């Protein structure tokens, strides 16, 4: 069911382009249009989503594409940086940094306590 909806939606393209390729007249009376195609080859021998766009319009569609692609990559990066995993990893690693740096603060304050008690004795 799911794959068949996908394949039908994909096969719609070939359906539309086949009926764009097919001539104006139905098969019981298509022989006139075939004859006119032979006539078109005669006048050539004697003498469709390609929507062509002018250059300022292509300038428009290119900066629009640039906006969409940068918005995509920002979007996915900010979903990554706001989803829970990144929060957990970042929080734990800076807690590691908290532990070691406040350890340095603690031992340094031990040196400061000895120094200030000695200075109080010295006054």
């Amino acid at each position: 069911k799911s794959i068949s909806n996908q394949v039908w939606k994909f096969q719609r393209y070939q359906l539309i382009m086949t009926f764009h390729e097919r001539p104006v007249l139905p098969p019981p009376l298509i022989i006139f249009s075939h004859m006119t195609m032979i006539f078109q080859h005669l006048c050539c021998r004697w003498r469709g989503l390609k929507l062509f766009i002018t250059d300022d319009e292509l300038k428009k569609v290119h900066d629009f594409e640039e906006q969409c692609i940068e918005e995509y990559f920002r979007e996915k990066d900010d979903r990554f940086n706001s989803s829970n995993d990144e929060r957990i990893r970042v929080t734990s690693e800076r807690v590691e940094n908290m532990s070691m740096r406040l350890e340095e603060v603690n031992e340094r304050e031990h040196s400061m306590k000895a120094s200030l008690q000695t200075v109080d004795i010295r006054l």
Partner: protein, 302 residues
């Protein structure tokens, strides 16, 4: 050493932060052209982080790339393994087994038509720069460089460089669709040569990658403005064989692209021709067929 040989050691070490802080410092001197030579040596060794660094400083690919420079990139023998030798052997056996032929832009051309397939007559078979190849081997520069660096990246199986080149440059969704078809075609061709199944599975996985990116950018363009998203889907890709984005999507057989809502409404808009009914559309075209004067009451597209 001076910053050229410092940077050469940096590209040797693959430690881009070291180059970020010391070799790239405020007011550092570089000889004229050392950045470009280091950029060449970076891209031949698949050094995407350093590529970010150099392009952030201002190597500026629009001036960096020349015909002989891409001729050097396609002829590299360093880096991780790629199957371009197998593919060019296949196309020269199918068009006209010694190795080592100094792989031309024209040969890369023939590889692009064999893999892309269909009637994708690429730029690299055109007689125009082939006449320029007679006459030279910023006219000798490529006007849109990142496209050619994508096709180089996807033929030498870089992926890391590919994604970085899909960042910078115009015609992005076109680049993704061509990359997706190219990866799938290389996968089936590697399966046809009875090569390793691992590289075939990897190339297929890369094809699903670029296809998924194409879907996500199409959905994003749908949510910003629908009307320009249709024009992005229809506009003539003169830089890719004068083709169309939907034509490249169906040539890549990519199932989720066409079935996305914007593509479906574009096909619906094409099906109703130059008309504007849609409402109970079924009980009106028949009335137009059987009775001709009823064509007056149809509201055609303005």
């Amino acid at each position: 050493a001076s910053a050229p040989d410092q940077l050469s050691l940096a590209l040797a070490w693959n430690r881009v932060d070291i180059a970020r802080s010391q070799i790239f410092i405020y007011g550092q001197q570089w000889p004229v052209g050392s950045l470009e030579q280091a950029m060449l040596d970076a891209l031949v060794l698949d050094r995407v982080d350093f590529v970010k660094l150099l392009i952030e400083n201002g190597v500026s690919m629009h001036r960096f790339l020349t015909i002989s420079r891409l001729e050097e990139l396609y002829n590299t023998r360093h880096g991780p393994s790629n199957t371009l030798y197998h593919l060019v052997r296949d196309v020269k056996k199918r068009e006209y087994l010694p190795p080592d032929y100094r792989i031309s832009l024209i040969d890369i051309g023939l590889v692009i038509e064999y893999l892309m397939g269909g009637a994708y007559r690429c730029n690299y078979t055109r007689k125009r720069f082939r006449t320029l190849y007679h006459n030279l081997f910023e006219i000798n520069h490529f006007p849109f460089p990142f496209h050619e660096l994508m096709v180089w990246a996807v033929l030498m199986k870089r992926q890391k460089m590919a994604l970085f080149f899909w960042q910078h440059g115009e015609e992005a969704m076109a680049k993704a669709l061509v990359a997706c078809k190219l990866c799938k075609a290389m996968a089936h061709e590697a399966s046809e040569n009875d090569m390793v199944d691992d590289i075939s599975q990897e190339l297929n996985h890369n094809s699903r990658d670029f296809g998924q990116l194409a879907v996500e950018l199409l959905d994003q363009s749908y949510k910003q403005d629908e009307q320009l998203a249709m024009k992005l889907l229809t506009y003539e890709l003169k830089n890719w064989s004068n083709a169309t984005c939907l034509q490249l999507a169906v040539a890549a057989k990519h199932r989720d692209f066409i079935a996305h809502t914007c593509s479906q409404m574009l096909l619906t808009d094409m099906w109703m021709g130059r008309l504007r009914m849609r409402k109970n559309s079924g009980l009106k075209v028949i009335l137009g067929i059987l009775l001709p004067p009823s064509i007056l009451s149809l509201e055609f597209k303005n």
